[PDB]
Design a protein around this ligand. Sequence first.
Ligand SMILES: [Cl-]
Ligand SMILES: [Cl-]
Lengths: 265, 265
Amino acid sequence: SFATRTSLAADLAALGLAWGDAIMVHAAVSRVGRLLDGPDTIIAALRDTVGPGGTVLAYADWEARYEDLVDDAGRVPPEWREHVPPFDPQRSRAIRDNGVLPEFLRTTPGTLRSGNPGASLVALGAKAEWFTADHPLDYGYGEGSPLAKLVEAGGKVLMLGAPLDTLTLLHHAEHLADIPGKRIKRIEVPFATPTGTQWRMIEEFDTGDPIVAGLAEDYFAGIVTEFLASGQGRQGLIGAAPSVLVDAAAITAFGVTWLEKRFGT
Amino acid sequence: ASFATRTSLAADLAALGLAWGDAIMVHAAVSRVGRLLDGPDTIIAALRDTVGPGGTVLAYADWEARYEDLVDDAGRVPPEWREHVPPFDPQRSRAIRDNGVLPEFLRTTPGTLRSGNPGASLVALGAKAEWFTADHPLDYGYGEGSPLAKLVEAGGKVLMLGAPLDTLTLLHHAEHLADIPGKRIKRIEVPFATPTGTQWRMIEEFDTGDPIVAGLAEDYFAGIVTEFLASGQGRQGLIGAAPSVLVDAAAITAFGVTWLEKRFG
Ligand SMILES: [Cl-]
Ligand SMILES: [Cl-]
């Protein structure tokens, strides 16, 4: 049978999602079961559960398919530059590699989208403007980023059936961790401007593979599983989906400690 | 792989016979097109570039209407479910994604309009978008005065861009027009969003979920299209990597009516 916006809100409240929360969601929509409005049922239920003073967020990123073309310095070959679609935070699609919910949130009326393309978040609700403002273009998973703001605001992250290694916030722990050997990525990015396309080199720690050597690609999942084993966070069903709800500040500190124990001096 | 671009796709579309000023309805299987530098949006952009500002780009939106699984044998929603069913909102309801994401991506392109009969709804973007989407009759929404009838009246075109040939929605307008006996009729209750809340209405139309009459294969539209091509009409060729078929809307409609009337008839 169908789960509804009402039934999902009951499940979310039971799992610990609280009135006024800033909630970042990662979802595997099919695992939730039958939904009367599909992915939009999830968005509506989240909004119902945090209420008007809460904020609903997701990781947008952008497709940036031209990245396959760049040279070893990260630059776009001259013959391709004119063809590459520039980033526009109001128009560029969210990436769909981990389901359609971020794109569906992006196109829900009222949603705002932050300005660092590959690190961009979407936000809908009371603090959406603040969460998406002034996203630094370099090291966009670090200080002053939407992820840093989620920690500062005491926000939460919900894995709604999503694979645990897709918890984007742990890239903020990677950025913060005092460990050596961090992998740095440099890539040229085109930005839409009223005066035309402006290209800029972006530098950040790589988030496409673990920040340091010796880790499997899915190592974030193990960090989350250890966090839960330590007695932190909450687990329960949302619809039919096994789900995990964690405090943003708590999981970030745990991930920093996890990395510093294994790679620090 | 190489990347197709909005420039290269526009060249392919012009080569296939798409013309400046055309009203073009597109059905697309994005995966058949090969690598696209801006994904499905490359296709939309190339279509707009080829027809220009005086042209119009259309697609079949429909809507998910998942509650249809709940209706009783007269098509009505049982009382315990009525409050939970998301109402149709032409500006908000997703396009159905059964035949790919392009209609939904077109729907969320700035400026696109969406017609008011949910299950028969078209999206339209361009010079005649208001006319194409206005006053869509709620009963028999594939018939007179519908966006599909208007496409025929305007001398528009239909492009199967890698799409299976039996997904040519316009041939449901031929089914509506054909003077044949035994036509199957569908009745279903539909909720509409309004300023004062949900308003329910019974909709009646010829059933477009199965062939209009008994004795036809489920994919019989595909055979009509290939017979149309075999008669010397229409154009065939690649768009990007995708085998594609471009037909005149008025011509394929008359052909399909004649095809049905010859047989049933
Ligand atoms: Cl879905
Ligand atoms: Cl379709």
